[PDB]
């Protein structure tokens, strides 16, 4: 599935989202990873880790707001767009994170999201 689920125990992921919801019960914890073996480097792991971005956003925030937060976090240039997926589906821009969360959250508490960047 997601790199984060192979490298973090369920127990630690569940604890992480439990703590987030205890303090921010109206916020959605989001784990984003890129849509993307003698293909190995000493750099590969640190760089894969840095591609994983977590967010904690209001349940009332829209998909668009999330996408703008991700754009800021990835510090994308003018010729660059980011698009996001929930289980192969591209969510509507006006959808609320809380509604997507209710339907698509993982058992560990995170909403998992794949992102691709396109260089228009």
């Amino acid at each position: 599935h997601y790199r984060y689920q192979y490298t973090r125990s369920f127990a630690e992921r569940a604890k992480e989202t439990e703590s987030a919801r205890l303090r921010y019960p109206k916020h959605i914890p989001i784990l984003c990873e890129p849509t993307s073996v003698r293909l190995f480097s000493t750099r590969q792991q640190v760089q894969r880790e840095l591609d994983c971005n977590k967010f904690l956003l209001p349940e009332t925030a829209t998909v668009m707001e999330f996408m703008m937060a991700l754009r800021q976090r990835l510090l994308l240039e003018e010729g660059q767009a980011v698009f996001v997926f929930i289980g192969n589906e591209l969510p509507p821009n006006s959808a609320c994170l809380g509604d997507i969360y209710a339907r698509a959250k993982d058992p560990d508490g995170f909403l998992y999201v794949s992102y691709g960047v396109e260089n228009t």
Binding site: T35, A81, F83, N88, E89, L90, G116, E118, T120
Partner: protein
């Protein structure tokens, strides 16, 4: 993974070609992400001695888990001549 990018001056052709690629992938048991529409490209020529504009519409399709039958089917796809297609494998 098969990533497909489409470009066309005519957005009618691009949406038809896109739906055709998606359908084909789905009929052969692959998973599809998209279509993803990208922002239309806007170029202009200034007429001297008044603007002429060329828009290029853009769509992306990701085929995940291509089968034997998926690739075979893409190769046989009769796509409109005004749509340019680019494919990169995973």
């Amino acid at each position: 993974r098969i990533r497909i990018r489409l470009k066309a001056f005519d957005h009618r052709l691009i949406d038809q070609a896109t739906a055709e690629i998606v359908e084909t992938a789905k009929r052969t048991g692959a998973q599809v992400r998209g279509p993803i529409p990208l922002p239309t490209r806007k170029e202009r020529f200034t007429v001297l001695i008044d603007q002429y504009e060329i828009r290029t519409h853009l769509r992306l399709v990701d085929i995940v888990e291509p089968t034997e039958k998926t690739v075979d089917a893409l190769m046989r796809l009769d796509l409109a001549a005004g749509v340019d297609v680019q494919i990169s494998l995973g």
